[PDB]
Design an enzyme around this catalytic site. Structure first.
Site, PDB file in Angstrom:
ATOM      1  N   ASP B 108      -0.601   0.883  -0.071  1.00 29.78           N
ATOM      2  CA  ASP B 108       0.838   0.317   0.439  1.00 29.78           C
ATOM      3  C   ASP B 108       1.679   1.936   0.231  1.00 29.78           C
ATOM      4  O   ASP B 108       1.246   2.773   0.348  1.00 29.78           O
ATOM      5  CB  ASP B 108       1.092  -0.819  -0.174  1.00 29.78           C
ATOM      6  CG  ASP B 108       2.447  -1.185   0.341  1.00 29.78           C
ATOM      7  OD1 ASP B 108       2.377  -1.839   1.210  1.00 29.78           O
ATOM      8  OD2 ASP B 108       3.519  -1.003  -0.233  1.00 29.78           O
ATOM      9  N   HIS B 278      -3.373  -7.707   3.191  1.00 30.21           N
ATOM     10  CA  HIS B 278      -3.062  -6.422   2.625  1.00 30.21           C
ATOM     11  C   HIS B 278      -3.338  -6.083   1.430  1.00 30.21           C
ATOM     12  O   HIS B 278      -3.603  -4.753   1.081  1.00 30.21           O
ATOM     13  CB  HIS B 278      -1.424  -6.354   2.748  1.00 30.21           C
ATOM     14  CG  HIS B 278      -0.775  -5.267   2.329  1.00 30.21           C
ATOM     15  ND1 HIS B 278      -0.959  -3.935   2.993  1.00 30.21           N
ATOM     16  CD2 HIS B 278       0.284  -4.861   1.544  1.00 30.21           C
ATOM     17  CE1 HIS B 278      -0.055  -3.077   2.615  1.00 30.21           C
ATOM     18  NE2 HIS B 278       0.661  -3.498   1.869  1.00 30.21           N
TER      19      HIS B 278
END
Lengths: 297, 297
Positions: B108, B278
């Site tokens: 991320d 994610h």
């Protein structure tokens, strides 16, 4: 605590099949419906409606779910807050007044109702004015980094409930004022009448009202887009004479004026920039009023 | 009281010119820096770090401004929270440990630091793994209606201060949990160790930490994009052997096929999807750790 900003206007609760529309009604002459947008209420027309009321019966309505209009129960598709549905509801409201053929000026969300109305039922309209919008389709089609930052709220408020609702509840007073200020030429609230800001602030302080606004934006991301897409694909143009007014510091000519955009959506469109941010009737009431009067008369 | 999720790991407060970097440090062997992203802290590696620590000296760092790392004051350009600045700061931090050539895995935001590090300072990196990202440029370049709704937070958190900060401050717990949950495969918090969630929530509860996250996203919408844009338009590729891992239900795969995108950015990149949302290291710890051990070994 709420000032009456339309002295001499009556106040009508217009029943429709989806709930009451609130309106200030003044003037005499041909009917002219004025629809506000976000995050405002009908009072945003308070500086120009008096001038319009010189020549028209001016109906200053709260959008369904906004201001003092009733808030129809939404659904998974945000149906009542789709511009198609709001246009249908306002047509019904105008019919309760015996107005089946009327002029229409919308700002922001109200202008999205207005051009969808023109697309769905052009026979209802003598003339259309839209203030500082492009069709919803165009905004989404234009979506890029620059627009995503500028109209972030199009994607933020379209997030599934209760994400925006919860975030907006974090500081609603700040948020509505921030939206008001940030979209003006000034960057502050000085263009607004303080008493109108209080109208907007009080409306925005209601969580149910905020939820409706999110429903409106969710419609704006989904059904409203699809509806517009059908019209683009069918080549459906608005046949109503229309005026597109935009704030020179609203969203203008980086690579196409709003006029060039509206020409693809309308067969008879005239346009002008107004020296204003987004809130034409409040930032530039004289210049908006004269443009509107010239166009509708 | 926050749990120690890294049994046996030391804890290092690394001084840099831009503030201290907190890191957990364990293992032995070649240095491997692990960088978390948003809205997480270094503890999101707690399921994969001990496996890595069998083979590598694992440095699990809080990003500048995140977790227990110091928060450099930002500026109008969000400079300390640009990935270029964070990369430089983490290079400094690693140099403090005597690591001038190290492996790097980022997730991320941390992955954005990581590929920016590799573009700016490739001689620092033996190998690079990025988890569930495409370059920031690519997210912005692919920001159409669908993607703008998917990662609305890229444009919402990039709004000028204090708009996101003010909305986030009403109920920070809601937002941090909503983002953790919304980006997993399951759509809830079940992938996460509850003790890890508490780390994330506690960091998110600090308004200065929230501000830093917005600064990160502001950098992400401006300076980071500009730095990326320069590299892509110059055809600058990462020369460091790279692994791109991404969740099959993650963020990166919804903009575009990640390996095709990464091959435009990296001269030597391999990629594998991992069945996961994610948060690869917490949703798919075993598969992530195995992919990272295999690649870094």
């Amino acid at each position: 605590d709420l000032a009456d900003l339309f002295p001499g206007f009556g106040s009508e609760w217009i029943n429709t099949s989806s709930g009451r529309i609130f309106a200030r009604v003044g003037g005499d002459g041909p009917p002219l419906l004025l629809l506000h947008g976000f995050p405002q209420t009908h009072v945003m027309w308070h500086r120009v409606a008096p001038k319009l009321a010189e020549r028209f019966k001016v109906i200053v309505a709260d959008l369904p779910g906004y201001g003092w209009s009733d808030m129809p129960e939404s659904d998974e598709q945000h149906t009542p807050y789709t511009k198609r549905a709001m246009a249908k509801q306002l047509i019904e409201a105008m019919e309760q007044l015996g107005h089946v053929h009327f002029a229409l000026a919308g700002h922001d969300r109200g202008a999205r109702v207005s051009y969808r109305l023109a697309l769905d039922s052009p026979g209802r309209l003598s003339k259309l004015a839209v203030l500082d919008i492009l069709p919803t389709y165009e905004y989404w089609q234009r979506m890029n980094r620059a627009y995503a930052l500028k109209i972030y709220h199009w994607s933020f408020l379209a997030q599934p409930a209760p994400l925006p609702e919860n975030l907006l509840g974090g500081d609603p007073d700040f948020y509505v004022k921030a939206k008001l200020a940030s979209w003006t030429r000034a960057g502050d609230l000085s263009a607004f009448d303080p008493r109108a800001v209080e109208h907007y602030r009080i409306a925005f302080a209601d969580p149910m009202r905020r939820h409706v606004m999110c429903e409106d934006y969710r419609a704006g991301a989904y059904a409203d887009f699809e509806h517009d897409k059908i019209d683009v694909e069918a080549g459906n143009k608005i046949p109503v004479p229309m005026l597109a007014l935009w704030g020179a510091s609203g969203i203008a000519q980086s690579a196409a004026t709003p006029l060039d955009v509206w020409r693809k959506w309308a067969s008879d469109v005239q346009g002008a920039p107004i020296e204003s941010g987004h809130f034409l009737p409040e930032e530039a009431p004289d210049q908006t009023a004269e443009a509107l009067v010239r166009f509708f008369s």
